[PDB]
Ligand binder design. Structure first.
Ligand SMILES: [N+]
Lengths: 162, 162, 161
């Protein structure tokens, strides 16, 4: 007869799926939970290409984020507003100029930066004294780079942490 | 005949558990290794909520760390002492002032920071010339933020990297 | 003789477990199959992250297509415009020096650096007209805050995982 891991029903003998496992006519497979950073293909189980977002939200204890080709931002609500930790992507960094980082269309307050040559400075922590991060709120920013004078003007919306 | 994936005892045919798999009367499940960043629920396999710690320890090749609601820090022992890489959490950052970062009650020797307006500065690397990181000793710090002038005097105990 | 259903298959060798995505089936039993290049491992203790998964995470963070890593520094390179810009993290207590001749890609000196302030530690480094590619050289000087050690290193670029 059948015992551990197998079961008998009207359909005959089958493999009984437990936690992390799917059983179908396509075989016994690993089941990955959506939004927890893994994928599974015919090559096997692995990290997906956005697992790093969950990691950075954990790092900063952020509850909302944005990510596009040129910047990502991890927002923490505290006191009367929000402070976010910024990482450049694709070669870009985030401008620290007065009008260049808006949350819910509100201009930022204090920024902490890293420093380049001349007047170059890259925003790494950005705060809004009286504006909160929330899902669906707009984030409008200007990114810059060190090769050309091109400014990247992006408008995206906040997403809840995974 | 029962063949690959199955095993036979006097009690019948069962699924044989290989690496990463557990088999019980309740079925075939994924087995995750405790300290390696994954979890398994009825919803499937995923990263757990502290996998980011392993990632950051790997990033800096750190052997000890701390994490609380205000800050996390990753320590590398080298020469006669140690150097730590600092990340703010929850919107906070670490004061870089002379008496504001202690390891085992010893004041730091050197700090590298990111810079804000006026005297605002956030510690990003902190070094002690002759104090070693080890599990069970205290890290004391002053957390601050960009919205209010409130400070948090914190104390958190070092833990071995996972 | 047999009435087999989901998860099982029957061949001339008998009834066996049918392997789907993420599963391997052998005489040693049913095991998890990890995609070895995507940061996971499987041992007798179970499935977990391997010790280079952090590199995949950091390439994702910066959308980098090449990197270097040694025990003193890691760098994540993004090709854009006519050149390359890289994001820099210290390792082992070290940091990347920001002097003019201290950071070369394919033997070419950088054009711009962004840094943290101490002493200064480079966090972003850029080359106007040099591209990142696998196998080319990254030559740098690493420093630390305890001693005056000058680590002159040369390391080779690796394709992002
Ligand atoms: N990470």
């Amino acid at each position: 007869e059948a015992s551990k891991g197998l079961q008998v029903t009207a359909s005959g003998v089958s493999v009984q799926a437990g936690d992390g496992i799917s059983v179908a006519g396509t075989g016994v497979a690993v089941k990955v939970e959506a939004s927890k950073g893994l994928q599974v293909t015919s090559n096997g189980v692995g990290l997906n290409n956005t697992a790093w977002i969950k990691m950075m939200c954990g790092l900063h204890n952020a509850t909302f984020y944005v990510s596009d080709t040129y910047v990502c931002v991890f927002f923490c609500n505290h006191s009367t507003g929000c402070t976010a930790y910024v990482y450049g992507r694709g070669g870009y960094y985030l401008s620290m100029y007065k009008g260049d980082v808006k949350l819910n269309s509100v201009d930022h307050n204090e920024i902490i930066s890293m420093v380049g040559s001349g007047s170059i400075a890259a925003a790494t922590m950005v705060s809004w004294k009286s504006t909160k991060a929330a899902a669906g709120i707009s984030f409008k920013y200007l990114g810059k780079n060190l090769i050309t004078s091109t400014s990247h003007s992006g408008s995206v919306t906040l997403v809840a942490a995974p």
